[PDB]
Amino acid sequence: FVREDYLVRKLTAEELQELVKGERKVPLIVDFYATWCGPCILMAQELEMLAVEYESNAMIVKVDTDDEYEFARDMQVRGLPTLFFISPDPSKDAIRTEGLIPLQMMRDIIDNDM
Amino acid sequence: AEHVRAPYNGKIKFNEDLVHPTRTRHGHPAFLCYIDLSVIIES
Amino acid sequence: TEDEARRRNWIERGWAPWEEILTPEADFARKSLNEGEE
Amino acid sequence: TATSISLGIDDLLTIPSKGWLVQDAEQQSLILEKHHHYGNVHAVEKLRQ
Amino acid sequence: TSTIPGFNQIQFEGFYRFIDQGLIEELSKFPKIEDIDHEIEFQLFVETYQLVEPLIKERDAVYESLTYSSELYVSAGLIWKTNRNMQEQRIFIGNIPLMNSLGTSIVNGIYRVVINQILQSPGIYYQSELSVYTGTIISDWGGRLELEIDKKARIWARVSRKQKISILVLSSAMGSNLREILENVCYPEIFLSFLLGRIGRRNINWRLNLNIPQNNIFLLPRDILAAADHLIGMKFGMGTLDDMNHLKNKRIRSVADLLQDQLGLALARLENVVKGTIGGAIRHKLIPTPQNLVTSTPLTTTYESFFGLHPLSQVLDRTNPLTQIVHGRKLSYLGIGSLSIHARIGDWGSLESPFYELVEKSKKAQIRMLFLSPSQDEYYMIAAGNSLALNRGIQEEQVVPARYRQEFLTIAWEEVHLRSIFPFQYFSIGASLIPFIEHNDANRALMSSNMQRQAVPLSRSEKCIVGTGLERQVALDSGVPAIAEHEGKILYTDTEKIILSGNENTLSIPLIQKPQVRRGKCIKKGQILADGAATVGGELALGKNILVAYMPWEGYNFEDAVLISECLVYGDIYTSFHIRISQKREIKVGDKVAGRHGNKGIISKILPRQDMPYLQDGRPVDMVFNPLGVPSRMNVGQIFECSLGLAGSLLDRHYRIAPFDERYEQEASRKLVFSELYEASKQTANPWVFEPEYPGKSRIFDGRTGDPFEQPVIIGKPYILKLIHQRVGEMEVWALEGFGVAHILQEMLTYKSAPESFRLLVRELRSLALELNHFLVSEKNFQINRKEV
User: Fold this and answer.
1) Is E325 in contact with E474 (CB distance < 8 Å)?
2) Inter-chain CB proximity E488 and A5 less than 8 Å
3) Which of E2, E101, E509, E524 is the mutation pick for testing A, counting most A CBs within 10 A?
């Protein structure tokens, strides 16, 4: 076996609707990157580090807005790098963050707001 | 071949009828001379 | 044979001596270079 | 030892008119390249320039 | 494409190709084997080929002095008679040596690397001998075939110096008649007037514009007909001669092709071993399938003799992390040079380099990097210029220096096809590690490479203040640092091991290094865990940043001798460990040091700290180079490295200057250096660092006097590397006898080792049945005394 080089998992918009409708044990982080975007090179590395640091205690996934542009617009995304933190409790409001937020702000949100 | 180079800024002056027209090794037009030619430089 | 090949160029290869309009430096080249290098 | 023969980036000393001379040789070459495209100058003359 | 390739990838992709096809390819050529009585038959069922993993791990094989190898098994049919006299046993065919990931094979305990071989590419070539138009097919077996015209055509094919036949006669022997020649050649009345492997097929098709299908791997007669037709073309001048020495006409054989050849030899030996054992089975009966009629000897001993003896299998130069990489990228004509940083061996054995493509408006390309061999890249206008020129015209018509065919020329961007965008594209690894290389005479680029390949790893290695950014690539690909194999949180770290936990699974990584991770760190898969010898922070760290002045001292730095401070002995700064037991080798008089710029020198003098020259900040300099070396070897780049290293020492900045920064801007390197010198000055309030009167130089003081040397001395903190460490000749005989000093000559040639060697001379001639007889004549008595010989 050779261990896969990346942990942040790309989803389609429908696979994301499935993942949000189904019950979750852990916070879901959704990254709306796009591959032409400069800051997304950095955000992808921050999210890879977050995805290692939290192991199975967070579900970190990404959605390329080249593919799911209308879904990004319906998510009220107004730019990239953008990130949703969706609580496992479905009553709570999700948090959208915009720009390269620090990895410590990601940890803060995941530990204290989700 | 030695190159003669202008020692001063100014206006070249000479009677160009004393010298034969030619095409240089570089395709530039030039004059080819077989005399002692005096060239003025009005600096 | 020059003239037979001239005819063969005209008839088969489609040759004609289309006159070339030259800038005076290109004409000077196309004349002076007939006489020698320098 | 009492002196020193140390070399620095501005101890080297490009001849001041080099820029003009290069500009000269550049402008002629550009003009010849232009005239080579025009078919006034053949490839051997351009090479030799 | 997007990034500098892994340096070992050329080996890696070669070895994987050998596994991915070379095994099938070579096993498929194993024939059915028939006995002498035509009744018993043996064959390998190649479809069952099975490499079982090495049962011994690398670190055990190297310790036990063994070969780290996978075991090949194949099922083998053997019909001992008709009907059920059949066995189809799975048999062990033998050990194939496996590559370790950094590109080396452990063979009998010693790391070996297979050097790449350069050969003349298969195909067809035309030489103008003396005019004697001479065609030559090269098959990929190295077999020549020659064609020639000297006058009036009458093309001969040549087989030997006494064997030439007209090509219509050869074609008749190949079964092609004059009607086929007439139909299949462009100039048939000229012909009538006379009355290879996959790479070879490709190159002959390309060079002759033929369209023979690839499945016709061998030479066809129509290939020779086309070669003669093109030779008539050359005779008329309807073509070009080919230059054999040019890099475009070379191919590279990697580890893949040599290992595959050695599998071919091993299987041909297996064929002889099966034939001989079937013989013993057909004469002594013996036992069927004892394992089978196969021994392990052919493969195992073929590969181990390849590694032991073949000139292209060489012990890994484990001297330092750079040489471990560079060795596996050598390119030898025997069986030299090294592959450029971005070079890739293509699927046809050509060496390909990446070029950005300027397709403008029509096409919708996805990836705009081509990879092109020197055969292709001459038919493109490659520019190396920049788009940073504008005029009352337009950017498209702005001209740049480009390369087309083998020529250099100036063309508009509108004409440019490709751009050579990567800085390191043409450099070897050693050349890429030299900052400001464009300011060093390229003659020394090889030498300055060699210097780094002689640098001893130092205890307390240290990152260079000025670099190029390839120290990272070298550290990563050397495999001397412990790279993580799996993501996770760190659990434990000491001198013996690192421990990871991730994906809720643990991994233990023993160190054979110092841990860079804190025990609380979290690690992504391929990040560094521990630095190796001569790495720091995952950068190559072959040397130390030594405070240096360039001034001629009182001869102890005569012609690149070097003075060092005693502090270099105090600080263990150049203390190495040499293992035999180990010895703590300090730096000594007569040790060799070099900068990366080819500024080598030998330590002649060690002075105490207060005898050194000292700066206006009071610090004594730690070495004194001599400046006459700088124009001797023409290396102005080191003065930049000096000055900017000083800046980096004072600003606490490292610098990673990619080559040819002058492409941005003229004087760009001077601007960087002077800018950072001025920043270091004004931030530290050290106005002597940037003296505007003579920037980069400063006045410095004699530690034995306190007076300043009256002219400013160039100062720096360059990166200095410590390097690794009786015939009486005929020209000495000529010199001694020139001095007439002939009793010394007699001593040196006789009793220091008639003389016994003249006894040998006479005895061997006497053994050739010639009497070399020595007489001397008495001056007194004329007696012919025979010498003792």
Assistant:
1) yes
2) no
3) E524
Q: Decide if A67 touches E, using CB distance below 8 A.
A: no
**Separation of alpha carbons E606 and E231, rounded Å:** 70
Q: Do D38 and C23 touch (CB under 8 A)?
A: yes
Give the Cα separation of E474 and E326 in Å (integer). Answer: 9
Q: B25 at the C interface (CB within 8 A)?
A: yes
Tell me if C28 and B29 make a contact (CB, 8 A cut-off): yes
Q: How far apart (Å, rounded) are the C-alpha atoms in residues C26 and C38?
A: 17
Phi-psi region of A64 (alpha: psi -120 to 50; beta: other; left: phi over 0): beta
| DSSP, res E769 | T
Q: Please check whether residue E200 is in contact with residue E214, taking contact to mean a CB–CB distance below 8 angstroms.
A: no
Q: What are the b/e assignments for E419-451, b being 16+ CB within 10 Å?
A: bbebbbbbbbbbbbbbbbbbbbeeebbebbbeb
Which of left, alpha, beta for E510 (phi over 0: left; psi -120 to 50: alpha)? Answer: beta
Q: What is the resolution of this structure in A?
A: 3.5
- Cα angle: A18, vertex A19, A23; to 5 degrees: 105
Asked if D10 reaches chain E (Cβ–Cβ under 8 Å), the answer is yes
Under DSSP, the state recorded for E614 is: B
Among B3, B22, B23, B28, the strongest candidate for a mutation testing the D interface, having the largest count of D CBs within 10 A, is B28
Residues of C with CB under 8 A from a CB of D: 23, 25-26, 28-29, 33
Question: H/E/C letters for each residue in chain A?
Answer: CCCCCCCCEECCHHHHHHHHHCCCCCCEEEECCCCCCHHHHHHHHHHHHHHHHHHHHCEEEECCCCCCHHHHHHCCCCCCCEEEEECCCCCCCCEEEECCCCHHHHHHHHHHCC
> CB–CB of E273/E91 below 8 Å?
no
Q: Which residues of B touch D41 (CB under 8 A)?
A: 26-27
Looking at CA atoms only, how far is residue D27 from chain B in angstroms? 14
Instruction: Please indicate the experimental technique that yielded this structure.
Output: cryo-EM
